[PDB]
């Protein structure tokens, strides 16, 4: 009717009708952007700027549309051109990520060249029900004697390290990482083999960087991948990172592979989620939190599962980190979290500055699931352990009268004095669950109770190489029945007497 | 009262003092109707990637290729300078309904069935001596609720007479229950 | 009557109507859309435009998308068949056992019961758990809280409650999750079909018979929108409400984590617009919480007992929801982290835990002076804590040694371990009735169990446990 | 929501075609006033920290410089001060 | 065209009414003729006397330590489960034998319970405990629930002065006792925030003192010309944590002529009504 | 480019282009007044409008008045010849001994280091002290907080640090004064010139000679506006990554405080009118820190 007018005059007007596909920013600022057009734009879809620069259909208001920028804003002026990807927000998944660290979208950074691609599994998915899911009936060996004794972590389970900063969170994780190297390399069977996911959020990158090359000093790459989001990259990525490790092990948890995935600072993925909140002018709570912290954490979280018979039978653990102020557990993000996982590894500053490592506390560190995730061999240990521990951590308030009080008191001051320095361990160095179940049986057996507490380093390491050398039959004999009957329990009394003959210590 | 509201009293006020009503009005009715049926000068009028003087050149080439007043150029330019384009439409809506106003009212009424010329030429009759409003152009409707008797609502909000079966029925039935 | 989708943000969707608009709280389901989307009207804002709230994530949705009003609220079934079943928000079986054959459907949203048909009538709970069978009388046909943070044993209290008391019922029963942990449920429907409390049968040709169970089941969990959160609780009244109107039945409900009603609405309001008040939370945050409670009551026709657990944020029972909470409860119950760490479980502070059921003319004189003996020897034991922790006991007189002695005694006796605690625990449980409770707390405050260390009273049930745990420990 | 120059006083000059807009930079007129404060349409050029004087006698600072109006703080009370008084620089 | 107004007289002696007026109980209408304005100008400084006339609580700290009078405005102040209804429930089971032996409407003692935020089952558990005392047929309630709106919640204590006023005024005496006073104010909240109006502190508007002294105002002790009537107020607040530093505790402290506090500390050590007669005062 | 002003509030100037719009953090400078006025982008709006924080006072500004795009952020300069100097946020010399006659500038918003190009091998930092060497041993690429005021002898193992360093491992310094008293700069410049931390020999036509140093100085003085003391570490972060990247050495950074940056940050979002978090603190508050403290 007159558009042979705007022809003329605009001189480019026919190009910009198709607002359905292609769309014109508007504003810029605080992460956020505004764009006229893309109609025909879902929400939570991926969008593409013009200098290569992506971002997330937030918001989809009457006429503009709200975008939440995966970068800094200066990639993106007023006036540039907005593409549809035409397709949610997704990564890739698979194999091919092992042994790779990528930004939170798959984006490869340590120079090696890019990642293969699988369907690309969308990222914020729903996660399973009532039916499919599974009960937890198998552990999963982190390598720590206290953990793996007396706070045992399944394999479909979501166990959460609370504590405050330099207190061994990242030497756990790491742990957790480096004992699973020859469970894989000796199984070859997928259905056995545990993978595994760490993510840093906002993690300094020399310390990622050291990580890394730790791992890849120990050869722990093969079966796990990394996701980085350090303090400079932007609050979008920190907060997306955590659901793209989430959507690495789906794969495995719906393929029927195990895995388990280590967010090593969720402290700071709310920290985002209350900026990019702010930003947006939404009103604040408590502590400037929002109320979509709880459905945040939670979307993540819950996603952690066994499945079942029917689908599969695959697993997925979780080990989310948080880091506390002054030990306060009755704050608000730590609450959240402890009323979502299934249990608590507490760590503390006190014990850390004593020279306790790993300085887990025990009775404030629990676990739902219990001795359902633990063998039989080492379910006859623990417990005492735990039993005896118990009676120490009770009595140990008059421990300053040992001389007045009776032998009974006396004993289990000893008794525990010994077990505490036995759950002792050095950094990147592990245990099997073997060599974890003769220390502990050595420990409950009174074999450390007149012995002195400085020399359990050197008796332990003499002893773990002993039956390294010659009771590998007991070893593998305890690996493979899951027990000990009387048969490999007396047999392992006698190479116990066998070295405390042999070798000479202070007591 | 509204920012279209302020705009087209200024314009019906000022296009009844000096260049005239109608023509501003068909001015106003054109640029509607082709808002309405071109839907790319929508898309102009909406758009932000047009420059303010790409818009003031193309409002002036349609005023010279169109029957134009300036009244109505001076009312784009302002709405240009005050980011107030959009609101063309609602400008002319406003612009539209006083002097409709102004000359005769349209009234909503409304009966069981179809009635008869006979008592539509009564009912338009009574109406027109009940108004004393030289011009009326009504509407015909169809709710059963008031049973046949013609209701109707003279279109000036404050008058709803309520000439019905039911509604008097049940006030006065409401009124005879009251006590003693 | 179809619409248009406008304007989405999160939770929240703007749909454009041409005709005639839908009335507010009525239901719409979205069709260009993969699952069955459902949107719950919520406002009216003019130019033919609705504001409504989604019952499932909003990822995948257009401006453009068509709508398609049902013209009533949402509906969900009712029935002998709902029973032995688990039930989402809308309704759909998420058992994987087939779907509903209910004959009616009711309302999610319906106007609670008026002031005559009302029915206060006092009675007594046997849970088997000495704190409350004392010091907190449970009443049959009323509410109950149990208020408390995170870790502290909510969850548990209340299976051993359903344990204690639905098993021992006959009635029927149902049970509501809002923000609860996925494991849990599974757990609780398999505990169900274990106890038989759920009877699921496998008929040839994959059907199912569930006839034979006594409690529903309704789970919105924290993998799922706020609105698809606040409007679990309203299901299971709704449920409820069918069984005490209609059955006449005398029912149990329920509910774990009420708290999040409130919290989906402080993450919804924002969105829908309001203004927010103190703590982000609604204006709405009393009204939209009678709404539920005043839906909850005894009446002429049946009887709903009430079990809600409370969340606590921060450990700060000043908060304006549990503050607003506790003014709607026949009986109360306050679990403590100070009391949790010291291995105490349940983790009940009797002083902030109370009732309405405790006066000398529902429970008897005996009955009513030991609980007010305990309360104030535990009051006179809390008033000396800061001398204790200043100066030391030694500072003390001797009838304060005395009340302290008894009240670290009596705080170790009011500790008992269940049966759903023993996979953690290892312990079997112990059912305390409420004559052996009295005679111990009795002769507790009289001074007949002075002689006895202090450890012999934890974890012991009666006074004959504790008597045979002092004689062991002796050696 | 509605600026100062959009008001109906203004407009029926801008319909109307008048271009008196040789008000200077150096005049404005006062459009709101309260608690010490007042609102005025002009002055495009005026500094910000700049003194300007009223009708009255009285004086005042001008500190928001804004796209539509300027603010600007009174030293005195705003009883003088109304309805498009002038406001003239220093 | 009418302004908010209530039914008066002793039509409601005996029932229980909503905010509006309109029963619930379930048994008959209202028989009242005469309407009143719900939101009202108190009496001024000429037409009211001094106190001189003892309000009879049924306790014993009460009347010795913390005397009332007719035409006072004494504060119910304490935690939550203290006795704050017991104790106007006493007070209102004290009146049935100092009106049952007399037939002076100048010396029978009627009284209003308003009820702001209570649930019904409460409500019902508070009617049956008078009806086995035969404490009804000098007493109305106006029950202003959780499920009733907040305009409902928000009129309930002006309906009840309302009602008072006509004893006010026609020579007798009267009583009011607001119940759960910190709901109103709720509801206020909640009003002016649903209505965009801004709030103030704790999310409250600034005129929550306006709204209070229009209340308690209307309570007073009329001359010897305007009848000799009296509207005696006792109404009651929540208080957590004892923090009576706050908003409402303190606004409402210092807008009344005594104070009548209770601890939870009093109450479990044994002393019950657990009174604190130091800080309470009169 | 060029734009022109169109609001002024306190230190937030919005400005407005007709074509070609800037991106953010970059600088523009205003025409038609003394005192040369800077300007960094923070924000678009809309309408070809941008947002800008001031580094200096805005009295005495217009709207209408004239305005330049750089093209770049604010642009430092570096090399040997910053040595011994003293330079404002903006790199001018505020020492009055001459302008920094450079052969090289950088912006002060950089990138940080990738993932791989990170050294994975932690090694300490010989500095020659010996209670620092034996119970709080330094790490190279490492960040050391320091907590005394006066009286204690701070000064003293700063120029320390910085002597020992220099001899022994070869590297430059910098320090950085973020909102510091006036006084207390010229203190800090003349114990410099004292203890030879820096060479100032005269030349006979007058001019200077910033001969062998080892501290270049980078000061956003208490007099200076918030984005000045926001964006005076980053212009001695890039100053030493000069250093870092190309001479190839082991550097210093001393920070007079680091307070005042988040102090200088809360301000700059109080202005642009971001909500403020729990304790006044602005939203950006990690983010900011880490954007400073990963490079
Ligand atoms: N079992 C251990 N044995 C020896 N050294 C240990 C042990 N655990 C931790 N350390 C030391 O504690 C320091 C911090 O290590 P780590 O990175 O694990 O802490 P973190 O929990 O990640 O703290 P943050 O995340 O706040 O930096 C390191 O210097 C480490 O060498
Ligand atoms: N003199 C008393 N003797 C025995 N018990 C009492 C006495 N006074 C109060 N109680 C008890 O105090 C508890 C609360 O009763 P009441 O109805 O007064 O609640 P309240 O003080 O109004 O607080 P709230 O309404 O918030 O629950 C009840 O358990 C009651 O039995
Ligand atoms: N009867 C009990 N005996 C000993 N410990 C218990 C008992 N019940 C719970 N605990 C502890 O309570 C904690 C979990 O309580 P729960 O109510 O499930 O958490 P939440 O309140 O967050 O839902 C566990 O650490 C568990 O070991």
Request: one cysteine or more; glycine letters at 8%; aromatic letters at 6%.
């Amino acid at each position: 009717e007159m558009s042979r007018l705007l022809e003329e005059r605009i001189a480019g007007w026919k190009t910009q009708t198709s607002t359905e596909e292609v769309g014109r920013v508007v504003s810029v600022g605080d992460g956020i952007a505004r764009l006229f057009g893309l109609e025909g734009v879902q929400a939570g879809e991926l969008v593409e700027f013009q200098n290569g620069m992506t971002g997330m259909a937030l918001n989809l208001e009457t006429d503009n549309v709200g975008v939440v920028i995966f970068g800094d804003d200066r990639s993106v002026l007023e006036g540039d051109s907005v593409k549809r990807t035409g397709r949610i927000v997704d990564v890739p998944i698979g194999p091919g990520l092992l042994g790779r660290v990528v930004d939170a979208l798959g984006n490869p950074i340590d120079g090696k060249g890019p990642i293969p691609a699988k369907e690309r599994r969308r990222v914020e998915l729903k996660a399973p029900g009532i039916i499919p899911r599974k009960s937890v009936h198998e552990p999963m060996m982190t390598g720590l004697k206290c953990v793996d004794a007396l706070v045992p972590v399944g394999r479909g389970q979501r166990e959460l390290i609370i504590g405050d900063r330099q207190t061994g969170k990242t030497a756990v994780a790491v742990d957790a990482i480096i004992n699973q190297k020859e469970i894989n390399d000796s199984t070859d069977d997928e259905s056995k083999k545990l993978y595994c996911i760490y993510v840093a959020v906002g993690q300094k990158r020399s310390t990622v960087a050291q990580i890394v090359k730790a791992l890849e000093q120990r050869d722990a790459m093969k079966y796990t991948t990394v996701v980085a989001a350090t303090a400079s990259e932007a609050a979008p990525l920190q907060f997306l990172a955590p659901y793209s490790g989430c959507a690495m092990g789906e794969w495995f948890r719906d393929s029927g592979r195990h895995c388990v995935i280590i967010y090593d600072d969720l402290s700071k993925q709310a920290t985002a989620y209350r900026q990019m909140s702010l930003l947006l002018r939404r009103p604040p709570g408590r502590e400037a939190y929002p109320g979509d912290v709880f459905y945040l954490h939670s979307r993540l979280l819950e996603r952690a599962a066994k499945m079942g018979d029917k689908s599969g039978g695959g697993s997925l653990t979780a080990l989310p980190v948080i880091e506390t102020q002054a030990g306060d557990v009755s704050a608000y993000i730590p609450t959240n979290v402890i009323s979502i996982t299934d249990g608590q590894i507490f760590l503390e500053t006190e014990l850390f500055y004593k020279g306790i490592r790993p300085a887990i506390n025990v009775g404030l560190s629990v676990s739902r699931v219990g001795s359902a995730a633990q063998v039989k061999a080492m379910k006859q240990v623990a417990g005492t352990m735990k039993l005896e521990l118990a009676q120490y951590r009770e009595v140990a308030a008059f421990a300053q009268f040992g001389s007045d009080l009776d032998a009974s008191t006396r004993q289990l001051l000893t008794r525990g004095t010994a077990l505490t320095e036995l759950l002792k361990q050095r950094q990147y160095s592990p245990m099997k669950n073997s060599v974890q179940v003769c220390v502990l049986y050595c420990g409950v057996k009174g074999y450390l109770d007149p012995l002195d507490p400085k020399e359990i380093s050197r008796f332990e390491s003499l002893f773990i190489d002993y039956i390294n050398a010659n009771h590998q039959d007991i070893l593998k004999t305890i690996e493979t029945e899951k027990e000990l009957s009387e048969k490999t329990e007396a047999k392992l009394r006698a190479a116990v007497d066998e070295f405390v003959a042999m070798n000479e210590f202070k007591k | 009262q509204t920012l279209e509201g302020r705009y087209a009293s200024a314009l019906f006020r000022v296009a009844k003092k000096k260049n005239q009503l109608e023509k501003v009005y068909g001015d106003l009715e054109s640029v509607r109707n082709a808002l309405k049926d071109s839907s790319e000068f929508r898309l102009f009028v909406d758009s932000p990637a047009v420059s303010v003087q790409q818009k003031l050149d193309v409002l002036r080439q349609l005023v010279n290729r169109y029957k134009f007043d300036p009244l109505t150029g001076n009312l784009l330019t302002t709405l240009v300078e005050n980011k107030r384009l959009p609101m063309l439409a609602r400008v002319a809506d406003a612009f539209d309904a006083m002097y409709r106003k102004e000359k005769g009212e349209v009234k909503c009424l409304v009966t069981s069935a179809k009635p008869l010329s006979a008592q539509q030429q009564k009912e338009i009759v009574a109406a027109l001596q009940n108004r004393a409003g030289t011009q009326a152009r009504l509407i015909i409707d169809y709710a059963v609720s008031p049973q046949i008797m013609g209701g109707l609502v003279v279109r000036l909000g404050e008058q709803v007479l309520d000439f019905s079966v039911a509604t008097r029925l049940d006030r006065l039935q409401s009124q005879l229950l009251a006590p003693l | 009557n179809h619409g248009r989708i406008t304007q989405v943000i999160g939770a929240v969707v703007d749909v454009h109507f041409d005709e005639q608009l839908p009335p507010i709280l009525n239901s719409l389901e979205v069709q260009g859309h993969t699952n069955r989307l459902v949107l719950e009207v919520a406002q009216h804002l003019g130019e033919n435009t609705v504001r409504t709230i989604a019952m499932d994530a909003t990822e995948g949705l257009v401006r453009g998308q068509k709508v398609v009003d049902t013209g009533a609220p949402i509906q969900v079934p009712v029935g002998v068949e709902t029973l032995g079943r688990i039930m989402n928000v809308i309704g759909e079986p998420v058992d994987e056992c087939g779907p509903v054959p209910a004959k009616k459907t009711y309302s999610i949203h319906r106007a609670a019961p008026l002031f005559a048909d009302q029915s206060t009538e006092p009675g007594l709970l046997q849970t088997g758990i000495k704190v409350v069978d004392l010091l907190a009388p449970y009443a049959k046909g009323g509410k109950i809280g149990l208020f408390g943070g995170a870790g502290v044993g909510k969850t548990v209290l209340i299976m051993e409650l359903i344990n204690n008391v639905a098993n021992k019922h006959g009635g029927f029963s149902v049970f509501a999750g809002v923000g609860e942990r996925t494991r849990e449920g599974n757990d609780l429907y398999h505990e169900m079909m274990t106890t038989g409390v759920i009877k699921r049968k496998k008929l040839e040709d994959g059907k199912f018979d569930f006839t034979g169970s006594k409690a529903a089941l309704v789970y919105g969990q924290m993998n799922e929108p706020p609105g698809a959160r606040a409007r679990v609780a309203l299901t299971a009244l709704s449920v409820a409400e069918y069984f005490r109107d209609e059955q006449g039945q005398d029912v149990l409900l329920f509910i774990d984590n009420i708290y999040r009603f409130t919290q989906a609405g402080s993450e919804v309001s924002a969105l829908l617009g309001r203004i927010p008040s103190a703590v982000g939370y609604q204006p709405t945050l009393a009204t939209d919480l009678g709404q539920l409670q005043e839906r909850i009551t005894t009446t002429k026709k049946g009887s709903i007992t009430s079990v809600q657990a409370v969340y606590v944020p921060a450990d700060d029972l000043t908060d304006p929801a549990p503050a607003t909470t506790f003014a709607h409860l026949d009986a109360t119950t306050v679990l403590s982290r100070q009391i949790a760490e010291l291995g105490i479980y349940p983790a009940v502070d009797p002083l902030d835990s109370t009732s309405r059921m405790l006066a000398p003319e529902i429970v008897g004189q005996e009955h009513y002076d030991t609980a007010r003996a305990t309360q104030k020897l535990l009051q006179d034991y809390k008033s000396l804590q800061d001398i204790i922790a200043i100066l030391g006991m030694d500072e003390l007189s001797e009838e304060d040694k005395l009340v302290v002695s008894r009240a670290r005694k009596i705080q170790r006796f009011l500790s008992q371990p269940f049966t759903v605690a023993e996979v953690f625990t290892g312990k079997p449980g112990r059912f305390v009735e409420l004559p052996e409770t009295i005679k111990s707390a009795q002769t507790i405050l009289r001074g007949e169990c002075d002689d006895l260390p202090e450890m012999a009273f934890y974890m012991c049930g009666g006074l004959e446990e504790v008597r045979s745990k002092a004689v062991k420990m002796a050696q | 929501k509605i600026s100062p120059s959009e008001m109906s006083r203004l407009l029926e000059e801008r319909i109307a075609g008048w271009k008196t807009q040789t008000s200077t930079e150096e005049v404005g007129r006062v459009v709101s006033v309260g608690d010490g404060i007042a609102r005025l349409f002009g002055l495009e050029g005026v500094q910000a920290g700049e003194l300007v004087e009223f009708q009255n006698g009285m004086t005042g600072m001008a500190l928001n410089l804004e796209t539509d109006n300027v603010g600007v703080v009174i030293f005195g009370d705003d009883r003088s001060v109304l309805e498009g008084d002038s406001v003239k620089r220093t």
